[PDB]
């Protein structure tokens, strides 16, 4: 299911970049790089024993602790709705991938 969501996640994400180009044109680039209104890169994962096997619950950004946001840019809302949603999908993707590898 997460893989099916993948790819469509990037297709949705590209709309945020198009909106940023339309509204604010070029990004801040360099260290700032702009284009981010939410989904700060902070996560929280823990190995959990399921069926006698420890399974890391890899919760990444948009689903991990200490996530932060800084208002909204011209396309910051589009980035949050597109790029940050991709992070939420990727959290489950990583957790499921680790669990599946360990279980296999």
């Amino acid at each position: 299911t997460t893989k099916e969501s993948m790819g469509e996640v990037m297709k949705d994400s590209s709309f945020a970049l198009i909106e940023a180009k339309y509204v604010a044109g070029e990004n801040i680039k360099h260290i700032v790089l702009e284009n981010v209104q939410n989904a700060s890169i902070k996560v929280r994962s823990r190995q959990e024993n399921i069926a006698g096997v420890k399974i890391p619950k890899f919760e990444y950004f948009t689903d991990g602790e200490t996530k932060n946001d800084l208002t909204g840019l011209a396309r910051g809302g589009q980035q949050v709705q597109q790029c940050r949603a991709a992070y939420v999908k990727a959290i489950e993707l990583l957790v499921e991938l680790a669990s599946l590898q360990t279980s296999f």
Binding site: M6, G7, S14, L33, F58, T102
Partner: protein, 107 residues
Amino acid sequence: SALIAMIADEDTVTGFLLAGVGNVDLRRKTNYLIVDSKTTVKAIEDAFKEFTTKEDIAIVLISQYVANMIRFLVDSYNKPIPAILEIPSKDHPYDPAHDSVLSRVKN
């Protein structure tokens, strides 16, 4: 904890790096910036084996597996938690090939 790509299409990575804080998973303070295509992304696999595996950053990112040069990280399928990544499009549609976790996920 965090997730450091340090190489990708960087289009969605910059927007997903950081907005308010968290140091963009220390990709700016440490490791490398999410921007890529300037050099070989085999160094990205080396950093993932070094920096991501150092417990600071859980995951990584590579785009389309075509120019991602992720065949060096093919052995990174073992220990999925230190090295877990899925190829997005980010204007470079994913192409199934030997990568960090692509072969294991597809199988």
